[PDB]
Amino acid sequence: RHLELNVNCTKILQGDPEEIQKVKRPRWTPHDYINMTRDCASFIRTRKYIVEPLTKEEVGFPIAYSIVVHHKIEMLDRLLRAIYMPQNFYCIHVDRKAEESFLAAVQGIASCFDNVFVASQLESVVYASWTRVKADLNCMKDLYRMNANWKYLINLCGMDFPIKTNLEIVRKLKCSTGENNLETEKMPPNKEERWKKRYAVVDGKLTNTGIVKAPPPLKTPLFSGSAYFVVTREYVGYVLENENIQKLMEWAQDTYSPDEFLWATIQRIPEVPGSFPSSNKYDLSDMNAIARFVKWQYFEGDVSNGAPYPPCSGVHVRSVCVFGAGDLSWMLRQHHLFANKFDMDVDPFAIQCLDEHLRRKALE
Amino acid sequence: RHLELNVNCTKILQGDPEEIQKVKLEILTVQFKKRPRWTPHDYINMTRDCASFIRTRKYIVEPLTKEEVGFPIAYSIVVHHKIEMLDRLLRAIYMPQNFYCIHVDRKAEESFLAAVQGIASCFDNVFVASQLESVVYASWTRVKADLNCMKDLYRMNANWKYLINLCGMDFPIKTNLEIVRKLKCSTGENNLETEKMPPNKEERWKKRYAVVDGKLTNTGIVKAPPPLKTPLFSGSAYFVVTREYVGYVLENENIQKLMEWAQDTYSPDEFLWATIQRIPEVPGSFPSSNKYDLSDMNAIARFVKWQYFEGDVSNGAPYPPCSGVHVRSVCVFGAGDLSWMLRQHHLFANKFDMDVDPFAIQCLDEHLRRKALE
Ligand SMILES: *[C@@H]1O[C@H](CO)[C@@H](O)[C@H](O)[C@H]1NC(C)=O
Ligand SMILES: *[C@@H]1O[C@H](CO)[C@@H](O)[C@H](O)[C@H]1NC(C)=O
């Protein structure tokens, strides 16, 4: 139990109403990590990172990660540790607007592992802009050329957390049998202004300029989706090299939230590795895809009455549920690989319980 | 191996335009269409000596892997004719650890039934259902045929994991091991088409139907609303369900109420399973929210090509044109349909017919056998 990580978690994980209510300040700073990481051997030991593969099955199925962050070093460290394995690869994209101490702290952690690094290209990410997509593309470039054996790439943000162990992830990926898995649905006509008009970053905010854009440079229709995906290395190589895709991406640079349509659209282009035909019969909702479990305030409700999922037990930020300990029990029963979003400032117990649970389960 | 099975199937499976064209011209040959075919009486005799039947037909009577042994599958096969296709189908999916219930329509020729009973007598885990229905197209009796097999299979063994129902025109496109793996990947959930009920399919349960002149017809009588809190969903007669789902369907009172209500609807097989799959508390079900809907293409139960959807895949069509022939808008596969088909994730495909293209079945059959023996 030396690798295991005053509330009873088991009761929380079982959805015990008693503890849920019962549950519903010291903290390391970037400088603590900068110092703490000087001695990698001790950092790794004290933080309890797993530096040896757990099974031969996992050794044979390497996974790559693109992690886009900009703050909260303790959360990054906790997320990294939860998903870290020696055989995998981890690219960390630190926003150019991040505090220098944060960047130094991230490099501090990354510098302790030969498979963790900071992307060779970094963007100043603006909410809803192409730069958010570019951040992942920067990591895709690095990850693709550095190793030819990883099977899938999963992109993450700082407030994500896994709800599956590395082994469980590997198994679900094998279950996809070479196909990609991400939300991709017929584009609602009502969102057309997101790409029919040109957007410009005005005073820090991406805004509609009213300038008319040309039609998308592709035969295939645009599809609606998420910024999060689970794609094969082959999909990545195609995105990075295919000329038509490059044309599509350059056209998308001045659209609104291109991250919410680019991946979903490419996933339906013929000849793209791991893609699905454009016929709507193949559409995948956020719940049917396994990329990310996210609760939207306007959809929460009585599951036995038509609701996709139960109400949030934490708090809502921009209509998105920031999980509370009470959300954990139902959440763990879903098939998604990761869930969003978590925040130590909202409910640190939702994190701790999940983290401890996955570590114990993995050590089995 | 004694178990392996002038056309080069390897090229067909690769979509070789040349090899495909060759099989199509072969089919047209008078010599081919005038080839000797087996009769139900041939099978009645051949099955007299089971040891000989098994060896001659090359049935696998020993598990291939420990993985498969630890994951038994049950099958409900609804048939009424074409004994050779039933033979090819059964052989292609047969494994000693699995269970197979065959429902022969009560209106099937007496010789067909005898033949089926003959084939079944050769395998302890293969049997004819204890209750046989006279199935009328689109009627509740089609559903009853499967319910009859569910009862027999559920009581016969408590260790099988999933039940997969089939008809005589189906054929697998996955080996038993591949099937076992996709079922394990389902993590105790069922898998079948289930989507929001289309407005153009409501007249089927809003009115009572009765068989008139051999066909189910609207009586004009309006029936009460379904005995359910959740909505009715649209789907297919074919499913992939856990043993737990089967036990719940056979036992639960409310489900019982739903079924009795559906008895006089049109094509209840196309909404019953899809609907039960969305009822809270049903083992392996999905929430009723439409975010969980599964189309025929996203579900893994059955790959079927509908004439009105076929087209340029690279332009919006869910699949390429039928290389075989269409019957009631459904594509009866030709050898040319195999290449693309094998790349799909479904467990089985429909429809196949050795009177349309025997090579479609043969190439698929050899490929799966070879793949399994590897
Ligand atoms: C069928 O053709 C393939 C190459 O297209 C070849 O590998 C295979 O051996 C051929 N089969 C026979 C029996 O000639
Ligand atoms: C075997 O089947 C043939 C028809 O194929 C039938 O005429 C014959 O009687 C059977 N053999 C016997 C005599 O048992």
From Swiss-Prot, chain A:
Chain segments carrying region Catalytic: 62-364
Major localization class: Golgi
Active site: 260 (nucleophile)
Compartments in which it is found: Golgi apparatus membrane
Residues at which UDP-N-acetyl-alpha-D-glucosamine binds: 68-70, 95-97, 127, 318, 341
Tissue: Expressed in kidney, liver, stomach, spleen, lung and brain.
EC number assigned by the record: 2.4.1.102
Activity regulation, per record: Inactivated by thiol-reactive agents. Inhibited by free UDP.
Pathway: Protein modification; protein glycosylation; Glycolipid biosynthesis
Effect of residue 157 to S: Protects from inactivation caused by air oxidation or thiol-reactive agents. Reduces the affinity for UDP-GlcNAc. Abolishes binding to UDP-GlcNAc. Loss of catalytic activity
Keyword Transmembrane helix: yes
Knockout consequences: Deficient mice show normal organogenesis and fertility. The loss of core 2 O-glycans on leukocytes is associated with leukocytosis and impaired neutrophil recruitment at the inflammatory site, while lymphocyte homing to peripheral lymphoid organs is not affected.
Disulfide bridge partners, by residue number: 9-353, 40-112, 91-139, 312-321
Pfam family, one: Branch
A GO biological-process term: cell adhesion molecule production
Residues bearing carbohydrate: 8, 35
Subunit: Interacts with GOLPH3; may control GCNT1 retention in the Golgi.
PANTHER family, sorted: BETA-1,3-GALACTOSYL-O-GLYCOSYL-GLYCOPROTEIN BETA-1,6-N-ACETYLGLUCOSAMINYLTRANSFERASE (PTHR19297:SF96), GLYCOSYLTRANSFERASE 14 FAMILY MEMBER (PTHR19297)
Protein name per UniProt: Beta-1,3-galactosyl-O-glycosyl-glycoprotein beta-1,6-N-acetylglucosaminyltransferase
